[PDB]
């Protein structure tokens, strides 16, 4: 079992949750987190996700019709 920075970063459900809770608990301190929260994970590597998280709500739901009034 090995790993290598290639293609596109791929996190795990558990990992994702860990981060979120890491912010509410620790905050904008990637260090404090990467320290205990996620030792293996990298400092920046953890940050990258943050963006993908804040950029959420991107056409996640399907289109739907409305009242079409007007």
Swiss-Prot record:
Localization of this protein: Nucleus; Cytoplasm
Organism the protein comes from: Mus musculus
Function: Acts as a component of the histone deacetylase NuRD complex which participates in the remodeling of chromatin. Plays a role in maintenance of the normal epithelial architecture through the repression of SNAI1 transcription in a histone deacetylase-dependent manner, and thus the regulation of E-cadherin levels. Contributes to transcriptional repression by BCL6.
Disulfide bonds: none
Organism phylogeny: Eukaryota, Metazoa, Chordata, Craniata, Vertebrata
Expression sites by tissue: Expressed in heart, brain, spleen, lung, liver and kidney.
Segments forming domain SANT: 8-58
Similarity annotation: Belongs to the metastasis-associated protein family.
Domain of life: Eukaryota
Protein name per its UniProtKB record: Metastasis-associated protein MTA3
């Amino acid at each position: 079992g090995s790993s290598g920075s290639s293609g596109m970063e791929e996190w795990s459900a558990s990992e994702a949750c860990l981060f979120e809770e890491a912010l509410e608990k620790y905050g904008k301190d990637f260090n404090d987190i990467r320290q205990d929260f996620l030792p293996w994970k990298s400092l920046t590597s953890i940050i990258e996700y943050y963006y993908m998280w804040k950029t959420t709500d991107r056409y996640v739901q399907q289109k739907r019709s409305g009242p079409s009034s007007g």
